[PDB]
Point group: D2
Chain length 392, copies 4
Amino acid sequence: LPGFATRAIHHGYDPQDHGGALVPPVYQTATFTFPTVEYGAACFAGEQAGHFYSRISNPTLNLLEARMASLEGGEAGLALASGMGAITSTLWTLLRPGDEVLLGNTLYGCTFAFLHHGIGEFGVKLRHVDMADLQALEAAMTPATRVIYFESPANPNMHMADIAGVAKIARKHGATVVVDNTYCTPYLQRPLELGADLVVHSATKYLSGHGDITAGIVVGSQALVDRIRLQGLKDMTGAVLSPHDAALLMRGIKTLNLRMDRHCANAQVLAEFLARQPQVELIHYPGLASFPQYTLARQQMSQPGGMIAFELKGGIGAGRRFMNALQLFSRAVSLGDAESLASHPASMTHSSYTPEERAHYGISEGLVRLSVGLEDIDDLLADVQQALKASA
Amino acid sequence: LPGFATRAIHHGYDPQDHGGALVPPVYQTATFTFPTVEYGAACFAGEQAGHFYSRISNPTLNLLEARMASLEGGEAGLALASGMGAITSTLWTLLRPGDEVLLGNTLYGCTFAFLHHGIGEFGVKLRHVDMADLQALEAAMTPATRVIYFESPANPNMHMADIAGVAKIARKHGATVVVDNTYCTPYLQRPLELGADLVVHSATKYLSGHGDITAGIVVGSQALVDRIRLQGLKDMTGAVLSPHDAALLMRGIKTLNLRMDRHCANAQVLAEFLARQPQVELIHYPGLASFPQYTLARQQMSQPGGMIAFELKGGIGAGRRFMNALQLFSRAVSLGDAESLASHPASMTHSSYTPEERAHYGISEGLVRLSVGLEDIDDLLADVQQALKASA
Amino acid sequence: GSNKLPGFATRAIHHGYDPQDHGGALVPPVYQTATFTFPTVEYGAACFAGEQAGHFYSRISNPTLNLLEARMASLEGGEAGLALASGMGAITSTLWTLLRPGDEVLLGNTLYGCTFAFLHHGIGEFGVKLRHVDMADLQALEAAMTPATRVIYFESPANPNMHMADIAGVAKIARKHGATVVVDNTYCTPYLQRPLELGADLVVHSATKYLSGHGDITAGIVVGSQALVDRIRLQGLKDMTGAVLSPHDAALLMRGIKTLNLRMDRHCANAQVLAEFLARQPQVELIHYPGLASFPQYTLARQQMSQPGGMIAFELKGGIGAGRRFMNALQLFSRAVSLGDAESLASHPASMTHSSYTPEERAHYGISEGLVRLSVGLEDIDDLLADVQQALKASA
Amino acid sequence: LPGFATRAIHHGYDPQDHGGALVPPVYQTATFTFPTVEYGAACFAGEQAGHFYSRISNPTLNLLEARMASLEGGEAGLALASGMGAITSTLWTLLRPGDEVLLGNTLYGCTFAFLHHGIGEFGVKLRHVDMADLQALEAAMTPATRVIYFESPANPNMHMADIAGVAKIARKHGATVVVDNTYCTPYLQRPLELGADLVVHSATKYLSGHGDITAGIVVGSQALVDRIRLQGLKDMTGAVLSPHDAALLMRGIKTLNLRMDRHCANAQVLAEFLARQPQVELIHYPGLASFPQYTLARQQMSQPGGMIAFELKGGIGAGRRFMNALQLFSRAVSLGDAESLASHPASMTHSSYTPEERAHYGISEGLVRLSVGLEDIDDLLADVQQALKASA
């Protein structure tokens, strides 16, 4: 079985099948024609091998999908126009009115919004549970529970879930487990190997790695993916990935291993640096020994990731001053880009919220999140250094 | 107000604001950075211009939207990853359980599937009505009726609706009118100017014109489009259009007047040809005086369009054989490309159904649909001629 | 029957591609790949010799570029095509392969500025003898031919006065003496004029202009005999220029070619209306447009060009102060130097391009102080008329 | 001065200057317009301006150029359509009939072809010298010697030149030193900091790193680069770089350091393995102690590189048999891609030539060249090991 890097570069493509082309040709075409109409008849049912549109079986998209399936250890993959494309397409197909879905304590903000103000407003029961608490999860299960969905690590405190534990319970009650694995990528964590049924990504982040495309991936069993493809994507979302964007994603995946290696190595030095500084109240980085769940993190993740969360003494005040003083880090909401990014949700995303109710969302007053990029650590250290001084 | 072609080329763009570039730069970027956090704070209550993330808005996508809204004559536009992206995003935000949606008698297959096997299984009521029959439409109106959605012309037989008459009946009961204007484009038909609240396109078709991208457009009021943007696209479908694909769509829109002129002139000659051939049982082209709704077609569409539906005397077998004989037309289920296309639903998209099942949904055994392309009319006539001899 | 040639539009959209041979893909896949591989090493031995038809490296050939080339060949009526990084890529690659020190090249009286520069300050400085001739004067061309005359190169219509050459007449003189004729066909495209069908050996294009049609790519084409195009591919392009066309940009070029016939029809119809309007205006001293009888080479234009083109040149009364104020009054026309874009462009040589020079130096080289040049775009003619009408008013 | 990786990601770009866009917009435009004729006046021999036409100046090309300048430590950069475009544009600008150019003993095939079958047939004189031999170089200088051109390391046997020594000699005769730095990249070797005047790159190789674009770079002093831009590029080649390709090139450059580190580590291992094998007569790799110019290589290269050449004992047959046995390595003539590549000149690039002409040229019958990619090293070893066995 060839290694991860090899697969990320080569899996599902032999140059001999496309006129010797070393890089697969991009199928920037909206539709495909048939040799006969009897060949056309077959395509819509399924029993002849081939393809019928860009919204289903484009070969550029098929290669992306297969390759992501191999990296995550799944049978099947699906490419979509965004991470929200992947999440919505998945949940829209697996759920109907009367079904219940269990969720991690905290979710990505647009995932939250979709559940509460979207699919939850169409008669689907929403329930929140701490997914490191196996006992509380078992007490939450009802006979209507069709889907369990969470992130691990989850934003913003890097809260881990016991994926193998959750999956064991879910397998008892006939529930489907869906893990958003955006933060780790398959290089660092493979939740399908710990017993999850489906994984979903915002490929916009680390997989692409260059902040230039928006894209989502679903990986899991052939049977779950076929359904999500033919119902969620085809009928209910229309979140079709451009073959141009899919080829840029495959391009980015070719350096995934190296990029994540650098993200992690930079993030550790920065996290260890933050630990020794007097402006920092507390840190959430999985590779510090003081991280509450350092044990579980190491069982699931092979390295501690590129994301650092920390809190500043001075709260909201010290955050604004820290963020505005950064000259190399950019002030922005994304993650997993080559460029280093900083976010202080109290004064950026959630300055439309009040301090009195802010703590209901698990958001500390002075919490600043850092996506550590690929820049020289010395320059990133110096930029962080002077911004901590400007926050006092 | 400058002419259509001037606006299709120029609207919403001055080179002088982008270093004099004649063609606008392509904003191929997932995220946008802020100068400070209090500047960033503004943008998450809609207080400042510029932007934050490409899943919500992007300057290339804004220009496409502005331009498309100018051409339909509407206030605001939204760009999405596909036509189904446009339709689902729209309806997901406008309907909730208990609401009724009133549908035209026939619909594009995937739209039918969204309604019957998607949103209609989440407790939204569906009723089908002949939109040409304004008495029966009035009769169908309940106060639960929140949306009237149709295509004009509609698949499969080019059936039409008096748009202004439907808008009148909507105004009376307080329902929102959504018209799928894919076939006509804003060049031949402007439903917003006849009372519709919203229009949706598969920009994949004529607007692109070249078969290379998948894309969707919503046009209407700022109020409705802002909702569809912030709920349907942002939370519920995730169908984000790639900036690369938006820039191609804009390139296609610059020749839309020229292409539609040639599309229409070619189909007219081809329609008049088919009406005289012994193998043809009947024919539906809006440009023929024998079209059932000829008067309504000259009233609403400025030209008769590029699509032809006709039925062969020999039923399903003659259809197959006609389809297989085509050498210049391709066998495919799209339309509005430079290449002429053909499909025969009874042997392609609807084959495993029986004759009874297809007559129920309006599809004759010998119904053939031609998308007349931009090729030399003599070559297309010659290809059609021989395929008809082959059909017997 | 089936030995009839498909019409121009049919071939612009279909020629040399079948979706069935690439998985049903309606649009051909883009081979954005720098390199190709070999199944055995013996398959690779033949592909650097000439025995086995295949693919080696994209600076020589690539299937996206090949399709583009076979298609342009068909439209021009040539055996073969080559695609390059720019118009000047096509020209330099062609002239660098055909000429050596001691050979003479006969040139039209006017040329595109970068071509002029290439010949006088480039290849002419490497031992290649240059000679200018009026190519509309067949007696003067006959007279300037020598035994060293290897290539006759010209544009028709020529930048910027739109001086025409008798292509058939030039090719006959070239048959007799033995020279290779190279025509820059940028202005007309294969839709309006096909120099190879009139006897030229090679044609070159700046496909950046009308062939693209949308101002977004830089590209060149050469069309001619298999032997010469091959020679140009393997000597000029491969060793001497490296002006490789990106497969992305070639795909866009093929996209633009699919509407070439429709865009040119509208360019021509807009410029005809605009030319007739400008002729009847008080401020206009004279106007140059091939579709007007007052065009110095009216009958030559009608003989070689199936329509009169999208380019107009005219002169304003009032000199430079009039031209300056005309240009700054334009609100739809953009001030810029190019042609064959969807957007209408205007340049005023005096206050723009030839600004460093004085009014005396511009009397030399035939550039009037009110000489405006127009690339008529695809916008609604009433808007273009209006923009020119209000601009003339402000130039008074 | 920030570190290499920081500059590779950020140099010459502030998101704040383009509406916050994290990735810079792609200026895919052939022409630029002017606000007035007076602004237009100062771009045709223009002092205080931006740009006029993409064959001379485009913001996207300008950014790539300034970034590549920073990495090589030179004043100005120029982007072109291919490496051969960069070489030819340079040499067409600097040489005229009667000038001599002094060449390294071996050259990349097309460069040699340019020199002997292009510019050398236009009156320019050619002389080949060993550029490690400072006394032979001094003996070869003449008053006609205007350019000294070479690669370091050089195809086929990784032969090095003493760049600082060469530059000292060129200085005494006023000659311009041009170095092809394609193999090392500015990450491993910066010939301008060793006294060279100009560097050229086939960015098609390592700079891109993913095998999808053809691109050339020239970097050097302002006055030289200006002339190559306005003469070589503008007039004599027309080798204009597509902005789309420049944007991809810039994408690839953001991981150059990480990619190069891995290319080198993979190649170091494979060289160690190949030196000890029975089938291997000789090996040329800068990282081995047995490499003739080991000390000179370590003075100029911070790491030994990703390229290996070695000779098989069994001659032409062993080469042929080895190449055909490869399953993971592709048979192909490029280099610096993520995918590992192999070429055996004597049965591929130089098959037509006689054994006597190959020896004269520098090519051994069993000379195999490896471009070691980014795959998992254990897979690359397996593939090489079995191919070595099949070589019998």
